């Protein structure tokens, strides 16, 4: 019951690292095999590249 429980904190965020960012309102507009997004990477190690 500590199960089901952790499956929804997964699912919630699955739907919540979507819809401030990473399209729908471009992917529905009509979605051609380019690269629709889950989430935003943020690592300090990154270069500009």
């Amino acid at each position: 019951f500590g199960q089901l429980a952790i499956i929804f904190l997964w699912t919630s965020g699955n739907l919540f690292h979507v819809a401030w960012q990473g399209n729908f309102e471009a992917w529905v507009q009509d979605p051609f095999h380019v690269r629709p997004i889950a989430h935003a990477i943020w690592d300090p190690h990154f270069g500009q590249p």
Binding site: H45, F46, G47, P49
Partner: protein, 730 residues
């Protein structure tokens, strides 16, 4: 035992069920023993308590091998004569691409055999006779067919000296266990009287018969076959009948000469072997020493002498034994023999000693990796057999209280250090590379380690290499260039298709491989050192030497109590060394082709098999499969339907055999039992099994069939990977 002892049977025993350890093979049947006995056919716990013979057996086994090489290589030298390639190549060298060996055409076979040649279909060869060979001057196929039977002569005879020991009524103790001479002789006149003798047949005959070959002809347009004695007009060219010197010495005048010699330094142009003429002098200047040297001496004398305060009392009578351990006087040897083989592997590629090598790329790197796996396969051994000492060999204690008894005194100590050494390395010796990935994949080169990025700045240049060629400030006199052409100072100019040999300048990205070697050489040795040291008794077991250097593992308790022993330290130490060498190989060819192996072109613009891709791109350890494994190897996986093909066609098997080892390496034992019965059941129903109790593998046999396969797997994989990226472009 008693079929029937002593005095009263000539009559041999074949039969009644046969032998070892006293509840001898049972009578009643088993499998394991058939695996025992090939293994541990000689150990020498058993056969006799008393050394007695065995030294009287090991001289005979030695004879067998010497013959055998001989059987070998008559074969080779055959093959080499009468499937010639050779006559054809030699007028022709630097065109030819040479075979001794041909299939017959049955079934598939013959894809294999693809035009090599002075016009014949072949399998191309990369061990060079044809280069040992250049030396014979006289030539022609039927002789080598004499040198060949001259081989089978030495054999039969250097193989009836092995009848002429053990089996024949044969020898006793003093003869080895009075040593007193033995190196006296050996090094003096064979070590000496060969190199000496070799001199005499290394200017007499060879020098002249390639002094005017290094032009062309069709041989014998040059050389008569005996031609070369009382005679000699011909020496006259290549120098004087000493004209008036006397037995060297001096009241001698040269206004223009000094005897053949005249030192070379650098490489021949139009045969870039290095001069065929320092080759007499050097061998001559050897032998003398040996000639003088093998004249010590009789012993403890020198060993019993110098002592120090840290230094060891033991040093003295550092071994009455030594004369009769054996297992120890083999272990010492292997370290040297072994460590004295892979010192070949360098002086070879950075100083060829045979005509046409370097230009011949593939026919001297095969070498530098074959000679390389022996200067390693013989070293881990050189530990095993010390472990075999450290446990057993002497009846009793009386070695006592020395130098050894010393080293052991510390032992959780010599190996206490060495350990940290390795984790210091590894962290400075591999994660070093991993930086690059994690940060060049992050991508910010500013801060990598690239030869350009983290600052040393663009010179390698001065350490030794630059002092080494640059050589004559010196008490040094000699010879226009180097001892080794590669060293930094000097020269464009070496060879006729192709580049043979050039500076190699390193920087960084020679810096850190050179360091992974350290850490790889070091953690190898940790396990063998701690292995052979903790041989007999340990903090985990005291009752530890009691059967074995082998025993499987003492038992589930103490936590683990499994690996321990020292068969197994010489089981997990092979496991490393397979890398030690396997990555040193990976080093040389990626260099030697990324830089050096070459071509010359008009105005000498060098064109390395790869324009130095190494540069910024070995440093990344993916570049090691971007630039290596995935780059080269494209010739292995393209190799089908060809001639070499047997490599691509191996490269799958043996790249299979390896990935079969893990099954033997990674698994239980009463498992394949538990299985072997389900089997044994089905077997009995039809009435088809019991007799010779079928049994699973002997804990440590299972490890024996790991390892051994993991190596002949993981190894020939590259033996294929290689011969497939030097044959054909490169």
């Amino acid at each position: 035992l008693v079929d029937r002892d002593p005095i009263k049977t000539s009559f041999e025993q074949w039969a009644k069920p046969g032998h070892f350890s006293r509840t001898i093979a049972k009578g009643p049947d088993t499998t394991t023993w058939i695996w025992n006995l090939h293994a541990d056919a000689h150990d020498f716990d058993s056969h006799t308590s008393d050394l007695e013979e065995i030294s009287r057996k090991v001289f005979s086994a030695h004879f067998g091998q010497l013959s055998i090489i001989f059987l070998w290589l008559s074969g080779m030298y055959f093959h080499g004569a009468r499937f010639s390639n050779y006559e054809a190549w030699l007028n022709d060298p630097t065109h030819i691409g040479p075979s001794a060996q041909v299939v017959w055409p049955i079934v598939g076979q013959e894809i294999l055999n693809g035009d090599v040649g002075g016009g014949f279909r072949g399998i191309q060869i990369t061990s060079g006779f044809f280069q040992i060979w250049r030396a014979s001057g006289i030539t022609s196929e039927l002789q080598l067919y004499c040198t060949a039977i001259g081989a089978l002569v030495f054999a039969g005879l250097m193989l009836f000296a092995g009848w002429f020991h053990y089996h024949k009524a044969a020898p006793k103790l003093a003869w080895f266990q009075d040593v007193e001479s033995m190196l006296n002789h050996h090094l003096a006149g064979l070590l000496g009287l060969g190199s000496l003798s070799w001199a005499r047949h290394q200017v007499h005959v060879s020098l002249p018969i390639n002094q005017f070959l290094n032009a062309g002809v069709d041989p014998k347009e040059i050389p008569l076959p005996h031609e070369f004695i009382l005679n000699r007009d011909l020496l006259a060219q290549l120098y004087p009948s000493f004209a008036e010197g006397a037995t060297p010495f001096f009241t001698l005048n040269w206004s223009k000469y000094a005897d053949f010699l005249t030192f070379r330094g650098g490489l021949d142009p139009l045969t870039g072997g290095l001069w065929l003429t320092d080759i007499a002098h050097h061998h001559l200047a050897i032998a003398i020493l040996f000639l003088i040297a093998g004249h010590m001496y009789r012993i403890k004398d020198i060993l019993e002498a110098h002592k120090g305060p840290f230094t060891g009392q033991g040093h003295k009578g550092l071994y009455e034994i030594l004369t009769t351990s054996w297992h120890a006087q083999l272990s010492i040897n292997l370290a040297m023999l072994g460590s004295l083989t892979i010192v070949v592997a360098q002086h070879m590629y950075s100083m060829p000693p045979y005509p046409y090598l370097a230009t011949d790329y593939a026919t001297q790197l095969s070498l530098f990796t074959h000679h390389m796996w022996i200067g390693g396969f013989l070293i881990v051994g050189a530990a095993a057999h010390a472990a075999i000492f450290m446990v057993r060999d002497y009846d009793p204690t009386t070695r006592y209280n020395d130098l050894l008894d010393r080293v052991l005194r510390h032992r959780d100590a010599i190996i206490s250090h060495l350990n940290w050494v390795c984790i210091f390395l590894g962290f400075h010796s591999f994660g070093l590379y991993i930086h690059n990935d994690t940060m060049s994949a992050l991508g910010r080169p500013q801060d990598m380690f690239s030869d350009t990025a983290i600052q040393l700045q663009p010179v390698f240049a001065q350490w030794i290499q630059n002092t080494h060629a640059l050589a004559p400030g010196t008490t040094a006199p000699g010879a226009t260039a180097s001892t080794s052409l590669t060293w930094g100072g000097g020269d464009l100019v070496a060879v006729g298709n192709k580049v043979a040999l050039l500076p190699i300048p390193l920087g960084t990205a020679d810096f850190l491989v050179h360091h992974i070697h350290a850490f790889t050489i070091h953690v190898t040795v940790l396990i063998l050192l701690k292995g052979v040291l903790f041989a007999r008794s340990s903090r985990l077991i005291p009752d530890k030497a009691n059967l074995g250097f082998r025993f499987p593992c003492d038992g589930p308790g103490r936590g683990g109590t499994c690996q321990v022993s020292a068969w197994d330290h010489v089981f997990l130490g092979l496991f490393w060394m397979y890398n030690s060498i396997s990555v040193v190989i990976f080093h040389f060819s990626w260099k030697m082709q990324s830089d050096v192996w070459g071509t010359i072109n008009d105005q000498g613009v060098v064109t390395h098999i790869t324009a130095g891709n190494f540069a910024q791109s070995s440093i990344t350890i993916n570049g090691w499969l971007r630039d290596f494994l995935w780059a080269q190897a494209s010739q292995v996986i393209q190799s089908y339907g060809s001639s070499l093909s047997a490599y691509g066609l191996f490269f799958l098997g043996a790249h299979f055999v390896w990935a079969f080892s893990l099954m033997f390496l990674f698994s239980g034992r009463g498992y394949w039992q538990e299985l072997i019965e389900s089997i044994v059941w089905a077997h009995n129903k039809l009435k088809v099994a019991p007799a010779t109790q079928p049994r699973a593998l002997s804990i440590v046999q299972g490890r024996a069939v790991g390892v051994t396969h993991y190596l002949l797997g993981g190894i020939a994989t590259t033996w294929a990977f290689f011969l497939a990226r030097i044959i054909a472009v490169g």
